Design a protein around this ligand. Structure first.
Ligand SMILES: [K+]
Ligand SMILES: [K+]
Ligand SMILES: [K+]
Ligand SMILES: [K+]
Ligand SMILES: [K+]
Ligand SMILES: [K+]
Ligand SMILES: [K+]
Ligand SMILES: [K+]
Ligand SMILES: [K+]
Ligand SMILES: [K+]
Ligand SMILES: [K+]
Ligand SMILES: [K+]
Ligand SMILES: [Mg+2]
Ligand SMILES: [Mg+2]
Ligand SMILES: [Mg+2]
Ligand SMILES: [Mg+2]
Ligand SMILES: [Mg+2]
Ligand SMILES: [Mg+2]
Ligand SMILES: [Mg+2]
Ligand SMILES: [Mg+2]
Ligand SMILES: [Mg+2]
Ligand SMILES: [Mg+2]
Ligand SMILES: [Mg+2]
Ligand SMILES: [Mg+2]
Ligand SMILES: [Mg+2]
Ligand SMILES: [Mg+2]
Ligand SMILES: [Mg+2]
Ligand SMILES: [Mg+2]
Ligand SMILES: [Mg+2]
Ligand SMILES: [Mg+2]
Ligand SMILES: [Mg+2]
Ligand SMILES: [Mg+2]
Ligand SMILES: [Mg+2]
Ligand SMILES: [Mg+2]
Ligand SMILES: [Mg+2]
Ligand SMILES: [Mg+2]
Ligand SMILES: [Mg+2]
Ligand SMILES: [Mg+2]
Ligand SMILES: [Mg+2]
Ligand SMILES: [Mg+2]
Ligand SMILES: [Mg+2]
Ligand SMILES: [Mg+2]
Ligand SMILES: [Mg+2]
Ligand SMILES: [Mg+2]
Ligand SMILES: [Mg+2]
Ligand SMILES: [Mg+2]
Ligand SMILES: [Mg+2]
Ligand SMILES: [Mg+2]
Ligand SMILES: [Mg+2]
Ligand SMILES: [Mg+2]
Ligand SMILES: [Mg+2]
Ligand SMILES: [Mg+2]
Ligand SMILES: [Mg+2]
Ligand SMILES: [Mg+2]
Ligand SMILES: [Mg+2]
Ligand SMILES: [Mg+2]
Ligand SMILES: [Mg+2]
Ligand SMILES: [Mg+2]
Ligand SMILES: [Mg+2]
Ligand SMILES: [Mg+2]
Ligand SMILES: [Mg+2]
Ligand SMILES: [Mg+2]
Ligand SMILES: [Mg+2]
Ligand SMILES: [Mg+2]
Ligand SMILES: [Mg+2]
Ligand SMILES: [Mg+2]
Ligand SMILES: [Mg+2]
Ligand SMILES: [Mg+2]
Ligand SMILES: [Mg+2]
Ligand code: NA
Ligand code: NA
Ligand code: NA
Ligand code: NA
Lengths: 71, 260, 197, 183
RNA sequence: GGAAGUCGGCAAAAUAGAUGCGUAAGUUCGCAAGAAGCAUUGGCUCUGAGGGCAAA
RNA sequence: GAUCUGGUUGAUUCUGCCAGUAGUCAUAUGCUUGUUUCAAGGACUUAGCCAUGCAUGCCUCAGAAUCACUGCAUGCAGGAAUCUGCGCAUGGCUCAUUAAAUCAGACGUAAUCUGCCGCAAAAAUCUUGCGGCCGCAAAAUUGGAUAACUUGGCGAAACGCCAAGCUAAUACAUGAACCAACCGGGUGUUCUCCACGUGAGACGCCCAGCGAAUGAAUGACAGUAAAACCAAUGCCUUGCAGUAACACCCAGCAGUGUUGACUCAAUUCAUUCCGUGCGAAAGCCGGCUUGUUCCGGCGUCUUUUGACGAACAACUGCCCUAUCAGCUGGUGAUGGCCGUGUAGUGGACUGCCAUGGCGUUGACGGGAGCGGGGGAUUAGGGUUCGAUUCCGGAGAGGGAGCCUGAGAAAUAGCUACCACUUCUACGGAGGGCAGCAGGCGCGCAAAUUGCCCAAUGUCAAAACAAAACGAUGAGGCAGCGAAAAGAAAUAGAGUUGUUUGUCAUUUCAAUGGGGGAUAUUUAAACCCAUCCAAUAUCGAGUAACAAUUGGAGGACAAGUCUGGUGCCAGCACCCGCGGUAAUUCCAGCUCCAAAAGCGUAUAUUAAUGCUGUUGCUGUUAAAGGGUUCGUAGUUGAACUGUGGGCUGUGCAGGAGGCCCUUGCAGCCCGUGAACAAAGAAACAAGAAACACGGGAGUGGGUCGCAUGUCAUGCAUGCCAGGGGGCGUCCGUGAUUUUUACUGUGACUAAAGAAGCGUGACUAAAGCAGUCAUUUGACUUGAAUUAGAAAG
RNA sequence: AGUGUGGAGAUCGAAGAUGAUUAGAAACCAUUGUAGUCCACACUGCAAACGAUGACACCCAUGAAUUGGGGAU
């Protein structure tokens, strides 16, 4: 995903942009999802960066993924 | 917990008619998974035809006349499954529960000194208290002292009567396997290669005797011999060779006309 | 009763979740132990599966471990001195995990004398290092060669009270086990305690 | 409740209720083959509609397609067995040319009249419904019985029928009882 | 009991400080507004927060 | 079957709707109805209210009988009752709630709990009996209570109750030494020895089982070659080749757990466990050969992990609405820290911090809805339905709370309140049909207070049988049932007269409906099927055993018919008809259409290219915004380029040569560099350079003799090196490459939909059956498919 | 066109007035006349605001003209 916000302490918001197909019109539409991801202090990513995230146990109300690699 | 099993919800391989009853016998917990097993009552009533209904099946089973892996089992809901040896001493019946090419359960007749041998795929290896290595098999058996070369995915050929391991066949390329799950269940082939995807399902690419290449997940393969020529267990009539559907239909039609 | 589900919580959008089922026993919570310092009193709690938790209401002693010495002793809890959640827990002498306590230093002092032949209580029932076999004296020298004790713990042993951190959960197991504070962690908490006398 | 016995329809009404050409054609078919209602023609119409639909689907596919090979062989075998198409016509395109009279000629009511066991199609139907005709020694009482080519030579009077090897019929039996009682 | 008194609620009763929440029609958009309403308040023993100055 | 027709004008050509037309397991309703097969059936409205009855119990050779119970016999065998153990958290019903919920496919739990079932594990424990803590001895001959029952009974009653007196259990409690092992830790101011203390060996003492808690150490290595110095310690003999380790009783009694990854499995050390754990149930029954070790079948405590499950999490997806634009954050909103709680993760919760989190890619609010599998309709694309059989979820009048239990926030369990209710002797006591049947209401709208456990299953202490038959309205079978679906009667052949055909005659045969049975079916019946003699079995002529429902101007098949009525009555979906010659109303006749069915109403699909992605229209028919700027959004120019040579072959084409069709073989497959071995160039991270026997079924391909012999050393080598190539694991190394699409493959319950085979008499079906007719073949068959998207 | 505040107010002229016409005529015609019409500033954003024809881009046959800029004689 792409880093969308880094305003939280050790938590970042990423975006997953994708195209959804509509069968009737034989055409796509742009959709996106937002995921709260824990970010270890060993990475320091920025807005617009691309990150790889791995699924972990629930770490908060919304967090289910941990940052693994910053590209 | 769930105690019933609707006949529509029952596995299709049990071949129970949708019109004859609402329910099917729910397998109890035990050696094999509920979706991957054949109940003893189904074996004694629907397959062997020794019992006309469940009440006669109860008559046979409660007396301990049916042995599974050299042990009388009195429950019609006992979940018999793959590679199990079922013996009825009174009628002199001995067969192994295997899969044919079409994925259905098959009763492959066995001779003596063959019903004493059963293959078990190692699914887990752990350490028990006292630093005792324990191997867990596909049929729920726990082995207190397996061979030091034993690995997960390997198969242990195991003497049921004497309750001891006698040989081990490693899970490597070039070994003969039988598929126990998926669309390729019942096919017999040789391991060409195994693709490893850590954190996901490993994929085994196999090749049968005729040269057909197929694949499945590594959990569905079951090593049964060093290679296709020397198997360590008797296999069903069709020898795990999938046969073209058009050719099969033509051969059946010709055979039917030859009969009449 | 008390529940642990997310149904009553607001969605991230701020909308209200419309609940369409009754509360389940599988999501229940229990009232806190609020274990205090005092003579031992526990209450068993039958948990899911038939297992028992021990809800400690009062505790007075526990197994406290000297990590650098790889030893532990059953010692009496003397006071609660610091709690990172609030100082009200200190005021009420509540025993929870990670809180800082002061425990009797006598068993640790006595073990040091027996194991190393060094009596920390110099300059003023009690083990005497003089009554030792010559073999034990040689083992004392062997142990003493590769050994250096820190002055902070050594001073605390001399005064008879040594600070420790609770490592168990009294509300779940009914125990007040802990580990003696050492090194930087002790210096951190000593500064916290030094604040405001 | 909890009954899983399947059932389905075998006929469909025509789209336009009143067409002079269609009504006259169906009236001709009813008289020619001794049918009871238009539903018997419409049943044949739906059958042919199904066969032509799968034939069109198969012919869309390329020749070497396994589904076309297996399904195409099966339907041609079905047509040859039931006499819908001649043995010479061995192409899938000839299924498309099947007509309603082709199916109607294979009815046991039609075959019995054509074989010569009945004076007319109406005589044939009542003979079938009155347990007088057997196909391979099995009594058949359904006029819409589609006769296989291999079964054509085995059509004859039933052994249990008075016209075959059976006992006397109602008229003679009742008169025999009356003669005994009157005497 | 509660305006039945009386021309008439005259007279009297009633409301009451501070703090938090909350507040309708209408409106020249400023108000209406302390609209209306709800809640808290003592004593004691503690805890936290809000500063100055000087010193390498 | 990719289809249209009537109505705008005097006529025409359009736009456009209205009306016609067909289907619907789609409901109701009206008329009609002989036979048979297969089936929906109080969901819609009132998750409205309910009289009565039933719906969940379980005993074997194998827990407990002194019924003052029965049979026999002088103890034997049944055995009411009642303790004990298991179940009642499943089934059945319903669809009210419900949109980051539920659900579907696909994944996780290393974040957990898990009775019954499968395979396994088990060496802790100072007990008992005779004599005086001590001695002798060893098949452990353990202890208190409470039911049923007896007595007295209370109470109008209550699936309501006291008190006393007996006696059991596999109920409850207690408790087993020696036999009987291996291993380790701490010590004695104890002995026997060596040297003048990393000394050795004994004995003595305290601990050393499974599981649990805290702390400490393990849970590997895999990025370099040689020399000396000292201290101790191994060998060699009196200085380092050889040398797994280890101060004997064990000279190999783990130097080696697992994953993709673990603080996990497991082991060692220290301390702890106070009931909130741990019997060989101090248990039961058999067999013989009758056994201080006879041999089996059961039952049970604890530990462990497969299985059946439970609970949590969420990758993508799901109607209408902006006359709903902001939502969330006192009092949790988003995240962080230490805690608490949970079976476990978590703002799930306390305290303290930081301002975050969501929204025009439609948040928030509102409206309609349980979600799927699937149904209807059908060129294709679509539209629409899904209360309802199977799967998942939720509920038991409304709410909440809770005990028991492995599992319930259970409701034919409990507690309370609210709303309804029943009995009463007025003190009190009760009730929950959205289980089956059935009532009352509600409505357009939906059956019997039936029979049975024979089948299908569930529970259980339980095979069947024998004085001896478990329960089951789950389920099955019948009754009612024109929802719907399949098959099919109501007549067939003549003869005479009136090319034919109709009519008037007159004959012949056949057959069911129905009536019955030596019987068959069925748990018993009932339906089907079989038969009307097998010596011996009833029956069609107006075959009265009598077919209906809508129509006859047009759309739309069928009358210039006859009377009646006279803009009245009425018909008429639309156009219209009827005002004295009605093709239309009311009737007769005749005819048309479908037919055991046929009208009507409403909804929905096609008709409809009148919702248009495929595929609409916008000058004048409805419809380009008055103009321009402009953000989201949609869309967006070209280029890095597709190779030669040779041979054969083909009207290739414009003598020989050049270029092309196809196929075969070569290419460092541009140029350069070497004689494609090495190096150079192109490459290659699905590579390259390193380095690990704990890497490779013993270190992958390429019968006596040497170690040694206090060893089950009962072992090891019996080609070695050098150089090349291949597996396994780790490390180092880059001014490093994905996604859509497309081709294959994997994973993916049935029912349903396609589809193969199969004369259930055909068919709707079903997954069966077929053939010799035999003491059984076919090693019978039950093919294969498609199924949104996402992964 | 209309509104607000200041200007301006010749002409024309909603409202209104008068005179005709007419069965009636508080219409058309005639003589007048307020607000307006004009300007500054600020509002309003209702036109047959029309080509009743959205914007950008491509292709497209013929004759005579026309406006602006270039090239040639
Ligand atoms: K205003
Ligand atoms: K009990
Ligand atoms: K029901
Ligand atoms: K034990
Ligand atoms: K936490
Ligand atoms: K908090
Ligand atoms: K009912
Ligand atoms: K009529
Ligand atoms: K008339
Ligand atoms: K008429
Ligand atoms: K834009
Ligand atoms: K215009
Ligand atoms: Mg008052
Ligand atoms: Mg007054
Ligand atoms: Mg008054
Ligand atoms: Mg008065
Ligand atoms: Mg007055
Ligand atoms: Mg006053
Ligand atoms: Mg307001
Ligand atoms: Mg017009
Ligand atoms: Mg007209
Ligand atoms: Mg005219
Ligand atoms: Mg009949
Ligand atoms: Mg009948
Ligand atoms: Mg209802
Ligand atoms: Mg229902
Ligand atoms: Mg007994
Ligand atoms: Mg249920
Ligand atoms: Mg699923
Ligand atoms: Mg012992
Ligand atoms: Mg009394
Ligand atoms: Mg017990
Ligand atoms: Mg342990
Ligand atoms: Mg390891
Ligand atoms: Mg969830
Ligand atoms: Mg939060
Ligand atoms: Mg609803
Ligand atoms: Mg549904
Ligand atoms: Mg409803
Ligand atoms: Mg359900
Ligand atoms: Mg419930
Ligand atoms: Mg109700
Ligand atoms: Mg229940
Ligand atoms: Mg409840
Ligand atoms: Mg009930
Ligand atoms: Mg209640
Ligand atoms: Mg039922
Ligand atoms: Mg009905
Ligand atoms: Mg019995
Ligand atoms: Mg009936
Ligand atoms: Mg009739
Ligand atoms: Mg009959
Ligand atoms: Mg029946
Ligand atoms: Mg006509
Ligand atoms: Mg109509
Ligand atoms: Mg008409
Ligand atoms: Mg359309
Ligand atoms: Mg169309
Ligand atoms: Mg249109
Ligand atoms: Mg227009
Ligand atoms: Mg481009
Ligand atoms: Mg070159
Ligand atoms: Mg199916
Ligand atoms: Mg079908
Ligand atoms: Mg002024
Ligand atoms: Mg003028
Ligand atoms: Mg306008
Ligand atoms: Mg316009
Ligand atoms: Mg110009
Ligand atoms: Na995994
Ligand atoms: Na007959
Ligand atoms: Na464990
Ligand atoms: Na039963």
């Amino acid at each position: 995903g792409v880093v969308h916000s880094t305003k939280m302490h050790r938590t970042i918001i990423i975006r997953r942009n994708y195209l959804h197909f509509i069968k009737k019109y034989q055409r796509y539409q742009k959709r996106h999802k937002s995921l709260a991801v824990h970010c270890s202090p060993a990475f320091d990513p920025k807005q617009g960066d691309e990150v790889v995230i791995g699924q972990c146990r629930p770490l908060s109300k919304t967090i289910r993924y941990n940052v693994l690699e910053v590209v | 917990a769930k105690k019933h099993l609707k006949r529509l919800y029952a596995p299709k391989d049990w071949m129970l008619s949708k019109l004859t009853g609402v329910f099917a016998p729910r397998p109890r917990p035990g050696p094999h998974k509920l979706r991957e097993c054949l109940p003893l009552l189904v074996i004694i009533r629907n397959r062997l035809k020794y019992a006309l209904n469940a009440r006669e099946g109860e008559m046979i089973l409660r007396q301990g006349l049916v042995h599974v892996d050299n042990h009388p089992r009195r429950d019609g809901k006992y979940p018999a499954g793959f590679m199990d040896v079922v013996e009825i001493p009174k009628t002199g019946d001995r067969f192994r529960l295997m899969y044919d090419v079409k994925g259905r359960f098959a009763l492959v007749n066995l001779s003596e000194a063959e019903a004493q041998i059963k293959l078990m795929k190692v699914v887990n290896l752990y350490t028990a208290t006292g630093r005792v290595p324990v191997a867990v098999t596909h049929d729920g058996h726990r082995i207190r002292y397996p061979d030091p070369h034993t690995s997960i995915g390997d198969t242990i050929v195991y003497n049921v009567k004497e309750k001891k391991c006698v040989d081990l066949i490693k899970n490597r390329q070039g070994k003969a396997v039988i598929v126990t799950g998926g669309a390729n269940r019942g096919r017999i082939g040789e391991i060409v290669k195994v693709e490893c995807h850590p954190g996901a399902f490993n994929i085994a690419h196999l090749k049968d005797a005729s040269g057909a290449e197929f694949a499945t997940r590594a959990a569905n393969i079951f090593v049964i011999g060093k290679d296709l020529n020397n198997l360590q267990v008797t296999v069903p009539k069709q020898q795990g060779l999938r046969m073209n559907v058009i050719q099969e239909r033509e051969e059946r039609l010709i055979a039917a006309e030859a009969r009449k | 009763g008390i529940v642990r589900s997310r149904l009553h919580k607001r969605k991230i959008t701020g909308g209200k979740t419309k609940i369409h089922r009754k509360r389940m026993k599988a999501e229940l919570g229990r009232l806190p132990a609020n274990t205090r310092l005092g003579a031992r009193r526990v209450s068993p709690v039958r948990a899911r599966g038939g297992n028992f938790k021990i809800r400690a209401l009062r505790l007075d002693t526990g197994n406290f471990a000297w990590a650098s010495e790889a030893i532990a002793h059953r010692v009496r809890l003397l006071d609660v001195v610091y709690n990172a959640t609030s100082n009200e827990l200190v005021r009420t002498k509540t025993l929870v995990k990670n809180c800082i306590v002061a425990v009797d230093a006598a068993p640790f002092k006595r073990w040091y004398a027996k194991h190393y032949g060094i009596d920390l209580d110099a300059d003023k029932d009690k083990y005497d290092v003089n009554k030792a076999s010559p073999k034990l004296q040689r083992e004392w020298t062997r142990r003493r060669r590769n050994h250096r004790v820190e002055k902070a713990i050594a001073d605390q042993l001399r005064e008879g009270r040594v600070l420790a951190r609770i490592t168990s959960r009294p509300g779940q197991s009914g125990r007040a086990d802990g580990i003696l504070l050492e090194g930087a962690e002790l210096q951190f908490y000593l500064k916290r305690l030094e604040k405001k006398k | 409740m909890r009954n899983y016995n399947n059932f389905n329809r075998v006929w469909k009404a025509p789209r336009r209720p009143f067409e002079k050409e269609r009504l006259d054609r169906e009236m001709k078919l009813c008289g020619q083959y001794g049918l009871r209602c238009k539903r018997e023609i419409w049943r044949v119409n739906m059958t042919l509609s199904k066969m032509r639909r799968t034939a069109r689907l198969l012919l869309t596919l390329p020749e070497n397609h396994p589904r076309r090979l297996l399904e195409g062989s099966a339907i041609m075998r079905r047509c040859h067995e039931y006499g819908f198409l001649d043995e010479e016509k061995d192409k899938l395109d000839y299924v498309l040319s099947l007509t309603v009279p082709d199916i109607l000629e294979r009815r046991l009511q039609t075959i019995v009249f054509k074989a010569g066991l009945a004076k007319s199609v109406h005589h044939a139907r009542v003979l079938i419904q009155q347990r007088h005709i057997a196909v391979a020694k099995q009594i058949v009482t359904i006029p819409s019985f589609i006769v296989r080519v291999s079964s054509e030579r085995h059509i004859a009077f039933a052994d249990a029928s008075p016209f075959g090897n059976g006992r006397t019929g109602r008229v003679k039996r009742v008169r025999a009882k009356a003669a005994k009682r009157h005497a």
